[PDB]
UniProtKB/Swiss-Prot annotation, chains A, B:
Regulation: Enzyme activity is enhanced by acetylation.
Protein family: Belongs to the LDH/MDH superfamily. MDH type 1 family.
Catalytic residues (UniProt): 177
Organism: Homo sapiens
GO CC field: cytoplasm; extracellular exosome; membrane; mitochondrial matrix; mitochondrion; nucleus
Associated clinical condition: Developmental and epileptic encephalopathy 51: A form of epileptic encephalopathy, a heterogeneous group of severe early-onset epilepsies characterized by refractory seizures, neurodevelopmental impairment, and poor prognosis. Development is normal prior to seizure onset, after which cognitive and motor delays become apparent. DEE51 is an autosomal recessive form characterized by onset of intractable seizures and hypotonia in the first days or weeks of life, and severely delayed psychomotor development.
Official protein name in the record: Malate dehydrogenase, mitochondrial
Modified residues annotated as N6-acetyllysine in this record: 55, 68, 142, 162, 192, 216, 273, 278, 284, 291, 301, 305-306, 312
Swiss-Prot/TrEMBL catalytic activity: (S)-malate + NAD(+) = oxaloacetate + NADH + H(+)
GO molecular function: identical protein binding; L-malate dehydrogenase (NAD+) activity; L-malate dehydrogenase (NADP+) activity; RNA binding
Keyword Transport listed: no
Amino acid sequence: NAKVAVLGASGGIGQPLSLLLKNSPLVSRLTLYDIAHTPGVAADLSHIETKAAVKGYLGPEQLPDCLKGCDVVVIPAGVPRKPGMTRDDLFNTNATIVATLTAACAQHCPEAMICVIANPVNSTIPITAEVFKKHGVYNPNKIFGVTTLDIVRANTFVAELKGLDPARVNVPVIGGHAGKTIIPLISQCTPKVDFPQDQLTALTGRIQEAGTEVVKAKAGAGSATLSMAYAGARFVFSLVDAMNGKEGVVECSFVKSQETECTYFSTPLLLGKKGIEKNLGIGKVSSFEEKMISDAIPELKASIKKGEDFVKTL
Amino acid sequence: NAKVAVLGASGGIGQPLSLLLKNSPLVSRLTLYDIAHTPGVAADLSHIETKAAVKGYLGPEQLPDCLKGCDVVVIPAGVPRKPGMTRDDLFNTNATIVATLTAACAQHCPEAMICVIANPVNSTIPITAEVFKKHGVYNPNKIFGVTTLDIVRANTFVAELKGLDPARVNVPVIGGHAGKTIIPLISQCTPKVDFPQDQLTALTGRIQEAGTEVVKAKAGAGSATLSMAYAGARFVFSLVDAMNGKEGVVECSFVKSQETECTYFSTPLLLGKKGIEKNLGIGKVSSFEEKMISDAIPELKASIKKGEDFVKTL
Ligand SMILES: NC(=O)c1ccc[n+]([C@@H]2O[C@H](COP(=O)([O-])OP(=O)(O)OC[C@H]3O[C@@H](n4cnc5c(N)ncnc54)[C@H](O)[C@@H]3O)[C@@H](O)[C@H]2O)c1
Ligand SMILES: NC(=O)c1ccc[n+]([C@@H]2O[C@H](COP(=O)([O-])OP(=O)(O)OC[C@H]3O[C@@H](n4cnc5c(N)ncnc54)[C@H](O)[C@@H]3O)[C@@H](O)[C@H]2O)c1
Ligand SMILES: [Cl-]
Ligand SMILES: [Cl-]
Ligand SMILES: [Cl-]
C-alpha cells in the first residue's frame, strides 16, 4: 500500500524507474511529476495490469497535488553529464532544482522518505537536509542519497571476475558518490573473495569510474538510465519492505552520519518502519580501504559544504 | 537458459524491454541491435547484477553476430505513430525495416522464435512469413505478432470497472491489432463478469482505441513504450517458460491461422517446446462478439494482402 512519487518522471531514469515501480505489488499509488511530458507517461503506465493507481502531474502548480499523502518521494529530476564533465559541473544547475523540489516535499509531505538521485549526490543531500531544516521538519532518518548503483556495479564486477552468480554477491560500498569517494569494501564482500592487490586496485578503479565510462559509451546521449532505474527501484523496494515491518533489510546510502568526521556519509543501514533503524557502521576494513577512506574525506567535506553554503543563499 | 535478441534495442520500447529481459533469470544472454546508440545502451545494462550477458551491436554489418545462436528474437524496430496517424501510415517505412531484419533472422537464426512488435502488426506478420518462405525456412509455429498489450489493457480496464485485482483478471482478445479488428472476448473473461450492453460497448471501444488514446496523451512524443515493454516481456517470458517445458502456457498472438478465412489471426494459443502447440480457437462467443469478428474480416484480409504484396516487390 505504499504511495510513491517520482519527481523528474519523464526523464531517462524516471521513465524506466516508474515502470519498475508500477510493476511492483508493493506500490498502491504512483504519482509522477515533471515539467514536461508527464501526462503521456502516466497514460502509458496506467494500462499495465498491476494494482498501482498511476497519476501524472505537470508544472509547479500541480506539484503539491503529486506529493500529498506520499510515503516515499524519489528525485531523479536533474541534468545529466556530457562526456568530459564531472558530477560537480552539474551543481549549479541541479542545486536549484533539488532545493525547489525538496522545499515542496517539506511543505506537502514532510513525513515522507526522500530519496535523491540527482547529482552531485555528495552535495544534493546536504541541500535537502538544509531545506528541510529551514521548514522546521528535518528528520535525518528519512533522507537518503541513492548510491545503490555503486553497490549493484560492485556486485556485477566482482561476480564476473570470480565466476559467481551476481545475485549471490553483496559488496558494501561506502563513502560518497563521486570518483575516489566511492569506496568498495571488497574485504567485506559475501561470499569472501581473494584478489591480489594489482587486480584489486584495477577492480576498485573500475567501480569508481563506472559512471564516467557509461557517459563515454553514450557519446553525448546522457548517462546511466536503465541500470539506475534498476538500482533506484531496488532501493525503494528495500525501503518499502522495511516500512511494512520486514526485518533485516540493509542498504548502503549517503545519509546524515557520525561514523566519520564527515557530517554525511554512506555506510550499510538497517532500514525499519521509521526509515533508518540503525547505522551499521563502516566496520573492520583493510589497510588499502582505510587509506581510501582517509583520502576521500577532504573531497566529501568540500562537497557537503558547497551544498550547505548554497542553501544559505536562498 | 534463453538467448534473446532485441532488434531495435535503443528505441522507446527497446530500452525498457531490454531492461525487463536483463532483469529476468530466464535470460542467459541478451544481444542488443540497433542502427543507433546500441553500444551505450549495452554498457548501461551490463552493470545490472543479474546473470544475463549483455552485448550491443550497431548497424547491418554487426546484425549477424547479434543473431547467431538466439532462441528468441523480439523486434520493436520501427517508426511509431504521431497524433492523427493510423497504424497503416507506418507501413511504407516499417515494411522495409521488418523485411530486412527478418531476412537476417531467416539466414542466421532460422530456428528462433520471432516476436514482431513493429506496426502495423496485421501486415508485418505476413511480411515476416513471406520473407522466411523466400529463404526456405518458414515455420508457422514460431512467428508471433505481439498483441499482448491489447490483453493487458483489457485486464486493467475490466479490473477497474469491477473493482478487481487486475493480476487475477484474464480477458481473451482475438482478431488483429488495429481498431475494430481488436476483439475483446469479455464473455470469456475470468473471472466471469456481467456488464450491461451499454457499459460493454463503451469498454470494448476503450480497448480498441487505447493506443490512439496514448498517442494523443503523448502529444507527439511517441506512442506506448513502457506498457509495451511490460507486455512484450510478459509474452517473451511465457514463450520461454513453454520452451523450458512449462505446461498450460496460453497467450493470444497474431499468427498463421485456419480458425477463420483470414490466413493470419489472433486467438489464444497453447505454447510448448516447439512454439505454438495448439491453437485453442475462438470458442463460444456472444452475438455481439460474432458480429465484431464478422465485421473485422475484410480489414484483416486487406492488411494481410498488403504485406504479401510488399514482399513481392523485393
Ligand atoms: N545517484 C546515481 O547513481 C545516479 C545515476 C545516474 C544518473 N544520476 C543523475 O540523475 C539525474 C537525472 O538523470 P537522467 O538521465 O534522468 O536525465 P534526464 O535529462 O534524462 O531527465 C531529467 C528529467 O528531470 C526533469 N526536470 C528537470 N527539472 C525539473 C524540475 N524543476 N521539476 C521537475 N522535473 C524536472 C526533466 O524535465 C527530465 O524529464 C542527473 O542529475 C544524473 O546525473 C544519478
Ligand atoms: N505491438 C504493439 O502493441 C505495439 C505497441 C506500441 C508500439 N508498437 C510499435 O513498435 C514500434 C517501435 O516503437 P518505439 O516507440 O520503440 O519507437 P522508437 O522510434 O522510439 O524506436 C524505434 C527504434 O527502432 C530503431 N530502428 C529503426 N530502423 C531500424 C533498422 N533498420 N534496424 C534496426 N533498428 C532500427 C531506431 O533506431 C529506434 O532505436 C513502432 O512501429 C510502434 O508502432 C507496437
Ligand atoms: Cl565526478
Ligand atoms: Cl541519522
Ligand atoms: Cl458480459
